[PDB]
């Protein structure tokens, strides 16, 4: 809303965008992961102080190492300790998105369960929850084959990223396409 307009001050800018970036963590969220960080809140905010963290939290939004942060933690963040949870939520979800984004590409779903889920480097008995929680994460679709140790999954995993299925895209999309013409040769032609 300010984006087009409204000249401001930095103490305004960062502190708000701090408080913003704070409120990201007092969001936390449907993750996020990545965000408006791209937008000129950064340098500007991060830089330093908690912005260091705040930025390193973007790292935590990727890294998801407790003690790359639970080291960092002072009161203000530990003031809401639930990021330790939220990071577990992160580490799951963080690991998840790409897994969801990438690992299967080949109609990505299964991710099922355990080692795959512990590939989040968050463990099986938490898989028994964090993984188990789905939209009890707020997100995951699908269900569980516990026996076979298999998630059923479906979407509600969006993202802003790029770079990848770009490639994979046209391949199949050329593939049928090509192999069309085989058929697509004479059908109406002949």
């Amino acid at each position: 809303t300010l984006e087009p307009s409204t000249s401001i001050t930095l103490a305004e800018r960062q502190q708000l965008a701090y408080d913003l970036s704070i409120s990201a963590l007092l969001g936390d969220k449907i993750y996020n992961f990545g965000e408006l960080l791209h937008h000129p809140i950064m340098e500007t905010i991060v830089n330093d102080s908690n912005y260091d963290w705040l930025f390193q939290l973007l790292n935590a939004l990727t890294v998801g190492d407790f003690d790359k942060f639970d080291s960092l933690i002072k009161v203000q963040i530990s003031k809401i300790p639930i990021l330790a949870q939220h990071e577990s939520f992160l580490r799951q979800k963080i690991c998840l998105m790409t897994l969801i984004e990438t690992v299967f590409v080949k109609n990505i779903r299964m991710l099922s369960f355990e080692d795959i889920s512990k590939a989040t480097h968050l463990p099986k008995d938490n898989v028994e929850h964090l993984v188990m929680r789905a939209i009890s994460l707020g997100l995951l679709k699908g269900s569980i084959d516990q026996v076979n140790e298999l998630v059923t999954i479906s979407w509600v995993q969006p993202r802003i990223i790029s770079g990848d299925q770009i490639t994979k895209m046209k391949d199949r999309l050329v593939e049928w396409n090509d192999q069309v013409e085989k058929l697509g040769k004479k059908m109406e032609a002949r």
Binding site: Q179, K182, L183, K186, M187, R190
Partner: protein
Amino acid sequence: AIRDEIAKNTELSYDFLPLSNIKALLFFNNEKETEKFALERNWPIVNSKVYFNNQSKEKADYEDEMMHEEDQKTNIIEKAMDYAISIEN
């Protein structure tokens, strides 16, 4: 020439067979006699046992584009039947 059949027969009959039995089947004395064949046969073999993990040649290039073209054939068949619709003139 006998045993190559039996080899396939064992292959067929046995995923796994004691390197004994096969030799016993091969009438061989040394199983390394056998072992050569089986590995000439390229048979999965652990200790004491000829195996067939794949008893057969499955895939391997040709015999394609027909007989397992899903819609393609079908579409060809369509195309064909459409020519049964088209050559219908």
